[PDB]
């Protein structure tokens, strides 16, 4: 009888509201934010993750970085800068969150601000606490006390029993390879994103490449004039309108689409190339960072 009771409780746990998926057959790269207070090493984790995946030592990685992590799915890493406008801009955008806590110093208001901004706007599937600066400790009893109290406060903040990784040192200016390897074990195998209503009704795009296509005669005539801008990125929400789509460039204002060119990917992800083996040969570990080095 108790087996039937537990089966009924789990069958009631499995249920949710029937919302619409709106995910294509060839899905766009899932967006990984690296959010944290200033000085915590978001750029260092970005360098270390892109070296783990695509083996390219970036001396200054900026912008979104698209990365092939499987034959079906791929990721893109964006590091949020230390400004609240960018944090509120990307909290409605993020697919998975890498939320950084500064170890010995404890929690920060920027971390709590992004946690409740994200919860109020829309909760994504996977948020992973990443706790760093553990090597700035002298007593390894105080170390496990700080790990325990930061884990319990984070569990009160987002949900009980989350994933909190501990990244200890900085060896080659980068991170330890085993620690970022188990971190990528957790963020590599993946599940479909949560059906958020705002992302499943409105079409968005996160700009990978920027270019100013303006005539130098116009720039020489008026140095402060209305320019035309080519913005290249992945179409992520629902589909854009074919003509006359109204666009909010967040932080700039509202405009209209003058042209859409729909062109093939720079990160092809071999299911799209072959359109049942497990491993990824190094032919496939592509890197598309059109603003970084």
């Amino acid at each position: 009888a108790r087996q039937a009771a537990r089966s009924h409780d789990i069958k009631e746990k499995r249920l949710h509201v029937p919302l619409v998926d709106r995910l294509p057959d060839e899905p766009p790269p899932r967006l990984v934010v690296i959010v944290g207070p200033p000085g915590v090493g978001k750029t260092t984790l970005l360098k270390s993750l892109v070296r783990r995946y695509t083996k390219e030592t970036m001396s200054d990685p900026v912008g979104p970085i698209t990365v092939v992590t499987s034959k079906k799915q791929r990721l893109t890493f964006i590091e949020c800068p230390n400004e609240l406008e960018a944090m509120i801009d990307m909290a409605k955008v993020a697919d998975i969150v890498l939320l950084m806590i500064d170890g010995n110093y404890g929690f920060e208001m920027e971390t709590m601000e992004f946690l409740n901004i994200l919860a109020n706007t829309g909760m994504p599937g996977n948020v992973f606490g990443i706790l760093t600066h553990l090597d700035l400790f002298k007593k390894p009893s105080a170390l496990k006390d700080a790990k325990k109290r930061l884990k319990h406060r984070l569990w009160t903040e987002l949900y009980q029993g989350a994933h909190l990784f501990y990244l200890s040192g900085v060896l080659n200016g980068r991170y330890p390879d085993r620690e970022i390897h188990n971190l990528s074990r957790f963020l590599s195998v993946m599940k479909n994103p949560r059906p958020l209503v705002w992302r499943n009704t409105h079409p968005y795009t996160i700009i990978d490449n920027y270019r100013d296509i303006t005539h130098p005669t116009k720039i020489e005539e008026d140095p402060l004039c209305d320019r035309t801008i080519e913005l290249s990125g992945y179409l992520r929400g629902t589909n854009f309108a074919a003509q006359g789509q109204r666009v909010h460039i967040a932080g700039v204002g509202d405009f209209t689409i003058s042209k859409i060119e729909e062109l093939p990917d720079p990160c092809p992800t071999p299911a799209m190339e072959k359109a049942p083996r497990r491993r990824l040969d190094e032919k496939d570990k592509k890197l598309w960072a059109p603003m970084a080095d």
Binding site: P37, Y105, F107, E108, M112
Partner: protein
């Protein structure tokens, strides 16, 4: 130059009610509950509390009432 997290976010108090300094310690509460329930007992029955003092017998110090029978009638 960092933004410290303050005590209200550090422990999620929320809107728990205000309770007593007696209620924050379960022994001191059970000390004060026993002192006041031993005090309520003297107002019902009569405790011994020492016989005649060192000074002797200064009279029945709080009244003598004549028309009061306080014996268990068997």
């Amino acid at each position: 130059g960092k933004r410290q997290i303050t005590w209200q976010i550090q422990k999620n108090k929320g809107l728990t009610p205000n309770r007593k300094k007696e209620q924050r310690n379960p022994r001191v509460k059970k000390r004060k509950k026993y002192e006041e329930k031993q005090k309520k007992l003297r107002s019902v029955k009569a405790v011994y509390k020492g016989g005649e003092g060192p000074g002797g017998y200064q009279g029945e110090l709080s009244g003598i009432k004549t028309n009061l029978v306080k014996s268990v009638k068997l």
